[PDB]
Design a protein around this ligand. Structure first.
Ligand code: NA
Ligand code: NA
Lengths: 173, 173
């Protein structure tokens, strides 16, 4: 089914890319797009935010409700092999570009000199440099689950990588 | 039916409010939110734009395709008495707030000292100052039609006014 407007409304311009409101207080994004040298995010001073970063995954937990209009939704560490996700890409022009991607292995992979814990995927039937931070989502029953943020792609764009939360598990090491 | 994501994607932050891409080259907004003193809009120099303004209605026609992802859609001068429209409000936070409004008479009305050609409406079951420029749309058959841009509201917000294109006609003088 198609991503509803409210889901798109979670995708938010941030730094040199985008991020995603998981709930009224939780924002996720790709580490390398986070602005450098600032003293606040969304008008909130850094000391009022719990900032967790693991490789290319960044999560902010704000101490006040930033998007009280939203329900919380489920964030998971990647998804099973073969899961078809949608990358909810917003462009600066306002265009929405949902990209279908069949996900592969969760691994720590070397990307441009750095080790990155993420999940690779194959673009179906692409992304650009400004798209980093866009969420990878998939529908489970009647709800949407977010499981990664856009972090990298092969020059062609045919293979993509989403950063995912830290955590070891027997399906991924 | 609910406004689809693509329709929302036409609503665009602009000046002190918003505007709406009617087509890849046509952008409409409320005159008073248009930035003052600038030499370009969306990176295009003023001399490359056909700028039409009538009271509180402003239309830009750009000489290049600014949103080539979009189809053209129908813009009309207001709508019939009693038509239920939706005001597609975006908030700075990213929240989407579609507001239902039953439209009334098209008239030139005095608003804060100025004569404004527009259509008033009643909010059903509200707006804020930063919402000006948001489109008033309604569904006709399988398509959406845009017919005004948010221009004013009573302090409570219960009555709203959308600016509409210039034009006289026997249903409106
Ligand atoms: Na849809
Ligand atoms: Na909907």
């Amino acid at each position: 089914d198609k991503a509803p407007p409210t889901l798109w409304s979670r995708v938010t311009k941030f730094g040199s890319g985008w991020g995603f409101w998981v709930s009224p207080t939780v924002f996720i994004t790709t580490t390398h797009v986070v602005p450098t040298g600032v003293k606040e995010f969304f008008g909130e001073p850094l000391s009022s935010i719990a900032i967790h970063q693991a490789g290319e995954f960044t999560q902010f937990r704000f101490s006040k409700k930033m998007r009280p209009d939203l329900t919380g939704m489920v964030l998971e560490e990647g998804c099973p092999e073969g899961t078809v996700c949608s990358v909810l890409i917003k462009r600066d022009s306002g265009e929405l570009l949902p990209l279908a991607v069949r996900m592969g292995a969760i691994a720590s992979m070397r990307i441009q000199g750095r080790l990155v814990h993420g999940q690779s995927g194959m673009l179906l039937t692409g992304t650009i440099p400004g798209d980093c931070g866009a969420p990878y989502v998939h529908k489970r029953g009647n709800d949407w689950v977010v499981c990664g943020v856009h972090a990298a792609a092969t020059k062609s764009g045919n293979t993509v990588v989403c950063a995912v939360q830290a955590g070891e598990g027997e399906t991924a090491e």
